[PDB]
Amino acid sequence: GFTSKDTYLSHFNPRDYLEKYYKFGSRHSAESQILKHLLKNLFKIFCLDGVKGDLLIDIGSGPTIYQLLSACESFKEIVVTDYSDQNLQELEKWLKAAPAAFDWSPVVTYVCDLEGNRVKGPEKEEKLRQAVKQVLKCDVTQSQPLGAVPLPPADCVLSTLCLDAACPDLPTYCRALRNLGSLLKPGGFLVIMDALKSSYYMIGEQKFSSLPLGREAVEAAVKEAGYTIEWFEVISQSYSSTMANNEGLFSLVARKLS
Ligand SMILES: Nc1ncnc2c1ncn2[C@@H]1O[C@H](CSCC[C@H](N)C(=O)O)[C@@H](O)[C@H]1O
Ligand SMILES: COc1ccc(C(N)=O)c[n+]1C
């Protein structure tokens, strides 16, 4: 069996998720080490590499913004999407600078440092808030992930830690890659970062399924789905034993063949 989609609407607590994985505490936890590596990869893709354009769609954003910090320097507009309405509400609390919003300042500061300290935290945060115009529902398992909502074909589709959680099997994972491709313009970029060989992840006592994929199956599915791989990186760093049973993480950049 595998976690049903509806479980994300009801049982995925966005504040608990942020507390458990993104607090970015002084302790050199496995979670903070992964967060740092993700940030470095995202900086390399968006600011160092030529990954830019008018529109980036972030798929399965959850309640997080860390994956958009470097992207807001390179894209006029960023659209954040998720299957969960609760997650999108928590994201909107940060976007609207509400009092109950999650404290992203340690991560924001870290991203500013990476980029050369050209700007400081508040200026960086304001650039992200200005870039995010739409907060949409999405279902990666559907041929139209965004439903009846129309969007121009995007220059880039980004998905961090979403596809392993949303796809119950390898054929569904390959179809989800094809479905994301429907949102991309020909030659547009696909950026995926996710756990390798992970069959579950936890949010406190709440268990969530994950599709356990190795690097070869991820690369094969991306090629089967109609992309060409630009680069593929595997990091050996895994989450704490209490959080997930992954054997590292991967990051890839691919281009949609027309
Ligand atoms: N079918 C589906 N379509 C879209 N999003 C889905 C989905 N099934 C699960 N999700 C979402 O996938 C996310 C996994 S958590 C990942 C959040 C964030 N991108 C990060 O990097 O931390 C959750 O927000 C969940 O709601
Ligand atoms: C931190 O969020 C994580 C961590 C690990 C996994 C997994 N697929 O093992 C999934 N998520 C969403």
Curated annotation (Swiss-Prot):
Listed GO CC annotations: cytosol
Positions of modified residues (N6-acetyllysine): K36
Gene3D superfamilies the UniProt entry points to: Vaccinia Virus protein VP39
GO terms assigned for molecular function: nicotinamide N-methyltransferase activity; pyridine N-methyltransferase activity
Keywords: Acetylation, Citrullination, Cytoplasm, Methyltransferase, S-adenosyl-L-methionine, Transferase
Keyword hit for Protease: no
Expression (tissue specificity): Predominantly expressed in the liver. A lower expression is seen in the kidney, lung, skeletal muscle, placenta and heart. Not detected in the brain or pancreas.
Residues where nicotinamide binds: D194, S210
Residues bearing PTM Citrulline: R15, R129, R178
Reaction(s) the record says it catalyses: nicotinamide + S-adenosyl-L-methionine = 1-methylnicotinamide + S-adenosyl-L-homocysteine
EC number(s) on file: 2.1.1.1
GO BP of this protein: methylation; nicotinamide metabolic process; positive regulation of gluconeogenesis; positive regulation of protein deacetylation
Post-translation changes: Deiminated by PADI1 and PADI2.
List of residues binding S-adenosyl-L-methionine: Y17, Y22, G60, Y66, D82, N87, D139, V140, T160
Result of changing D194A: Loss of N-methyltransferase activity
Database matches in CDD domains: AdoMet_MTases
Pathway assigned to this chain's UniProt record: Cofactor metabolism; Amino-acid degradation
Activity regulation statement: Inactivated by deimination on Arg-129.
Any single Pfam family the record assigns to this protein: NNMT_PNMT_TEMT
Similarity comment: family membership: Belongs to the class I-like SAM-binding methyltransferase superfamily. NNMT/PNMT/TEMT family.
NCBIfam families per record: GntF_guanitoxin (NF041360)
Biological role: Catalyzes the N-methylation of nicotinamide using the universal methyl donor S-adenosyl-L-methionine to form N1-methylnicotinamide and S-adenosyl-L-homocysteine, a predominant nicotinamide/vitamin B3 clearance pathway. Plays a central role in regulating cellular methylation potential, by consuming S-adenosyl-L-methionine and limiting its availability for other methyltransferases. Actively mediates genome-wide epigenetic and transcriptional changes through hypomethylation of repressive chromatin marks, such as H3K27me3.
Quaternary organization: Monomer.
UniProt miscellaneous comment: Prominently expressed in the stroma of high-grade serous carcinomas. In tumorigenesis, regulates the epigenetic reprograming of cancer cells associated with increased cell migration and metastasis.
Protein name per Swiss-Prot or TrEMBL: Nicotinamide N-methyltransferase
Gene: NNMT
